Design a protein around this ligand. Structure first.
Ligand code: EVV
Ligand code: ZN
Ligand code: ZN
Length: 201
């Protein structure tokens, strides 16, 4: 679910950052490592902000709303981290928003790849499962990525942990594809980010 908006792509892949107060040394290091993980596999670079007008701010607040998708422009933008969402893989996911990715399951073509089980969604959280409108996403010829760091788990926003809200529609390597990994960027995330940022081959 890569943004279609050219203005949201950070110029030259350069993303200035500020780490806010109220984070421990340990948390600050994880933010650095998550950024480095993005840097190792793509042409995106994260720089300590000096006088840039547009930059990200690691903002201490409860997990949830919101981390801005792509470059906002004309000022700072939040990447929001709290006590229950400060681990490496979660920060890598939220940095996925920063670089310009929406959630994978919101791709305009997602109904070919996953079923949404509406009856299992927590009432009031259904809006999180709406597709992006087709003018808002350009997938750059890349296949729907079940292994994406941007993909929801099977029971995200579910009424109960044993109730699925998202079910892949078909098998990959003779098994239903696992979804919701928060370990590392997938092959697909890297390939798609490289296309989005026009990285040298
Ligand atoms: C109502 C939508 C809820 C989305 C929550 C979601 C999320 O952040 N998803 C991705 N983002 C969005 O969908 C989305 C929509 C609008 C915005 C957004 C984000 C940040 C700002 C911002 O930087 N605000 C400033 C204050 C300000 O300048 O007004 C701040 O927080 O300091 C934003 O500002 C309005 C444009 C919008 O994000 C989060 C869940 C854990 N998640 O998945 C994280 O990985
Ligand atoms: Zn997210
Ligand atoms: Zn993708």
């Amino acid at each position: 679910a890569a943004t279609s908006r050219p203005e949201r792509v950070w110029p030259d892949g350069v993303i200035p950052f500020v780490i806010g107060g109220n984070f421990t040394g340990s948390q600050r290091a994880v933010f650095r490592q998550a950024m480095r993980h993005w840097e190792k596999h793509t042409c995106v670079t994260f720089l300590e902000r000096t006088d840039e007008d547009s930059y990200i701010v690691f903002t201490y607040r409860p997990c949830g709303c919101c981390s801005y998708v792509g470059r906002r422009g004309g000022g700072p933008q939040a990447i929001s981290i709290g006590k229950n969402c400060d681990k490496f893989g979660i920060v890598v996911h939220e940095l996925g928003h920063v670089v310009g990715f929406w959630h994978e399951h919101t791709r305009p073509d997602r109904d070919r790849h996953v079923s949404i089980v509406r009856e299992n969604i927590q009432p009031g959280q259904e809006y999180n499962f709406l597709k992006m409108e087709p003018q808002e996403v350009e997938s750059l010829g890349e296949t729907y990525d079940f292994d994406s760091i941007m993909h929801y788990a099977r029971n995200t926003f579910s009424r109960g942990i044993f109730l699925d809200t998202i079910v892949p529609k078909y098998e990959v390597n003779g098994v239903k594809p696992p979804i919701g990994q928060r370990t590392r960027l997938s092959k697909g995330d890297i390939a798609q980010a490289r296309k989005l940022y026009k990285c040298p081959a």
